[PDB]
Structure formats: structure tokens, C-alpha cells
Structure 1
Amino acid sequence: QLIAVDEKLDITTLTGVPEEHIKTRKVRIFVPARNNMQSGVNNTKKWKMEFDTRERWENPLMG
């Protein structure tokens, strides 16, 4: 009833993500730093995963 197959988990072929958004991205795993404007520490409890910043430009209309 069990296979017991030995291999690291990989679901990339099932998530539908385009190829250049898997291998070219660099995620950062970190506990966010406390906002120095305040003393509350409730925003520094969990871990966050975020992606690398890409290009942002100006819309020729409306800027």
C-alpha cells in the first residue's frame, strides 16, 4: 500500500509557473526587522519569504 520511494520532493512541473520565474528568481527567507518608528514587536514573530525586486518604470500616460 506504500511505495517507499527515496527522492527529494519536486513539484515544479505541476505548479504551472513559467520557466524563467523558477530558475532566475532568488527568494529571501527572513524574520522582518522591527519598524524603528514604533516599539511594538508583534510584527517580528513569523518568518517571511519574498522574491527579488525587479524593474519598475513609469507609465507614459498618467506617470
Structure 2
Amino acid sequence: TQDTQLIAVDEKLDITTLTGVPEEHIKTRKVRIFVPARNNMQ
């Protein structure tokens, strides 16, 4: 239906080479993922 060489590639998407992050901010930069808890004042 969308024939533009629709070919299966299953390796995990890794654009790490082109985003621009340096060699140390890619690994040492541990990142947290939470929902901001409601500010108890408000």
C-alpha cells in the first residue's frame, strides 16, 4: 500500500550517532522519568 521499499528492520532505534550529544553526556547523564508531584502549596 506504501511501496517505497517497505522492508523490516527490527534493531532498536538508535539515533545516538546523529542527535549531537557528546561521548560523555550520552552515558554519564542519568535521566529520571517521573510525573511532577503536585506542589503542596497549591
Mark yes or no: TM-score above 0.5.
Answer: yes
1:16 to partner: Cα distance: 1.1
Q: Runs of 4 or more off by more than 6 Å in structure 1?
A: none
- Flag structure 2 segments of 5+ consecutive residues without an equivalent: none
Larger strand proportion of the pair: 1
In the alignment, structure 1 segments of 5+ residues that lack a partner are 39-63
Aligned alpha-carbon RMSD (Å) = 0.8
Question: Which TM-score applies when normalising by structure 1?
Answer: 0.56
Deviations 1:10-48 (A, max 9, x none): 00001111010010011110011111111xxxxxxxxxx
Tell me the number of residue pairs that the alignment of Structure 1 and Structure 2 aligns.
38
TM-score of the pair, normalised by structure 2: 0.79
Identical columns (%): 100
Which protein has greater RCO, CA pairs closer than 8 Å, 6+ apart?
1
